[PDB]
Design brief:
The complex is a heterotrimer of chains A (about 70), B (about 130) and C (about 120). By secondary structure, chain B is an all-beta fold. Chain B contains no helices and 13 strands. In chain B, the strands form 3 sheets. In chain B, strands 2, 4, 5, 6, 9, 12 and 13 form a 7-stranded mixed sheet that branches. Chain B has a 4-stranded antiparallel sheet with strand order 1-3-8-7, with no helix packed on it. Chain C has one domain: Immunoglobulins (Immunoglobulin-like, Sandwich), CATH 2.60.40.10. Classes of the chains: A mainly beta (about 70), B mainly beta (about 130), C mainly beta (about 120). Bound molecules: chloride ion (CL) and potassium ion. Chain A: Belongs to the three-finger toxin family. Long-chain subfamily. Type II alpha-neurotoxin sub-subfamily.
C-alpha cells in the first residue's frame, strides 16, 4: 500500500503494509497549532491509548494530511 | 545550536529589487519556520512575512503584499527574501528569524500554522535604497 | 485591519527599582504575548515568551503578565545593563500577521530622585 508518512508528509511505498493510518492527539499547543498528526502505514491498524484518535483506511494514499480549516 | 547567516549589504536604486539570503548553519531548517523582520534606521521592528517549508506556505504582511516573495531551498537550508519596487523607506536592516516552535517532532507534525516567538536571529543585512 | 499593540515610547527607572513596560491591545489577554530586548547595533533577544515564561538563560528579574486590555513586562531590581529597547509581539491569527509593538526604551537613571 502507498501511504502518506510523517514527518516528511510524503507518500511512501509500503510493500509489506496494507493499511494507512491517521493518528491524532492534542499536546499543550493544540489550541494554537491544532492536533498533532502521525501518518504512516502498517500491516494492520495500530492501537492507540486514551485521548488519541486513529482512523485506518485501505486504499493508496487514503490518509492525506488533515490540516485544520482556518475560519 | 543552529545559526542563521545572512548575505552582505546591498545598495539599490529606487525601482530595483533585492534578494537577501539566510543560511541555517550549524544545522538545518525544514520543520522550523523562518520569518523576515526589518528595522528601518532608528525605528521599530516590522514583520515582512515568513515561510513554513514543510507546508510550502508563505505569509506576508499587508504593507508588502504584492512586492515581496519569501522562499526556502530545503536542500541547502537557505531562505530568501526578495523585495521589489524598492523606495527610500525600504532602507533598513533586514533580519531572518526562526520560529521557536517546530512544526514536526518525533514522527508527528502540527496541523495548523501559528507564528510563535522568534528564538534564533540572523546577524542582519543592511539594504540601502538611494540614487 | 490588523491588531494594534500600543507601547509607551519610553520609561525611566531609577537603579534597583522596578521597571514596568505596558503593551496594550483590545482584549490582549486573548493573545499570546512575547517580549524582546534589543540593544543598539545588536539583534533582538527574546526575554519573555507566552506571556510569562523565561527562555533558558534569561535572568529571573524579568517577568511578564497578560490580562484584559494590558500585557506587562516587569524588570525587578533593574540594573544598568537592562537599559535597552523592549518590544512586545503577538501573532494575530485573524489577519495572519505577526505584530510588533512600537518598542519602549528603558533608561536607567544615574541617580535616585529622592533618597
Ligand atoms: Cl498512542
Ligand atoms: K544574530
Amino acid at each position: 500500500i502507498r501511504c502518506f508518512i510523517t514527518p516528511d508528509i510524503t507518500s511512501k511505498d509500503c510493500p509489506n503494509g496494507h493499511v494507512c493510518y491517521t493518528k491524532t492527539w492534542c499536546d499543550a499547543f493544540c489550541s494554537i497549532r491544532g492536533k498533532r498528526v502521525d501518518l504512516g502505514c502498517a500491516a494492520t491498524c495500530p492501537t492507540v491509548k486514551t485521548g488519541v484518535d486513529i482512523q485506518c483506511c485501505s486504499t493508496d494514499n487514503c490518509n492525506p494530511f488533515p490540516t485544520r480549516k482556518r475560519p | 545550536q543552529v545559526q542563521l547567516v545572512q548575505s552582505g549589504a546591498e545598495v539599490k536604486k529606487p525601482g530595483s529589487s533585492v534578494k537577501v539570503s539566510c543560511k541555517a548553519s550549524g544545522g538545518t531548517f525544514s520543520s522550523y519556520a523562518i520569518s523576515w523582520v526589518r528595522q528601518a534606521p532608528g525605528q521599530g521592528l516590522e514583520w515582512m512575512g515568513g515561510i513554513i517549508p514543510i507546508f510550502g506556505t508563505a505569509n506576508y504582511a499587508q504593507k508588502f503584499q504584492g512586492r515581496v516573495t519569501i522562499t526556502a531551498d530545503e536542500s541547502t537550508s537557505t531562505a530568501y527574501m526578495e523585495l521589489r519596487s524598492l523606495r527610500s523607506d525600504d532602507t533598513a536592516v533586514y533580519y531572518c528569524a526562526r520560529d521557536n516552535l517546530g512544526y514536526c517532532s518525533g514522527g508527528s507534525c502540527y496541523s495548523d500554522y501559528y507564528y510563535y516567538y522568534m528564538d534564533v536571529w540572523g546577524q542582519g543585512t543592511l539594504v540601502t535604497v538611494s540614487s | 485591519s490588523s491588531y494594534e499593540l500600543t507601547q509607551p515610547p519610553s520609561v525611566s527607572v531609577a537603579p534597583g527599582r522596578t521597571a514596568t513596560i505596558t503593551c496594550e491591545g483590545d482584549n490582549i489577554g486573548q493573545q499570546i504575548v512575547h517580549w524582546y530586548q534589543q540593544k543598539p547595533g545588536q539583534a533582538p533577544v527574546a526575554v519573555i515568551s507566552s506571556d510569562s515564561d523565561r527562555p533558558s538563560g534569561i535572568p529571573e528579574r524579568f517577568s511578564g503578565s497578560n490580562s484584559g486590555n494590558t500585557a506587562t513586562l516587569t524588570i525587578s531590581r533593574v540594573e544598568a545593563g537592562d537599559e535597552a529597547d523592549y518590544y512586545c509581539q503577538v501573532w494575530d491569527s485573524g489577519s495572519d500577521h505577526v505584530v510588533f509593538g512600537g518598542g519602549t526604551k528603558v533608561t536607567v537613571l544615574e541617580n535616585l530622585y529622592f533618597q
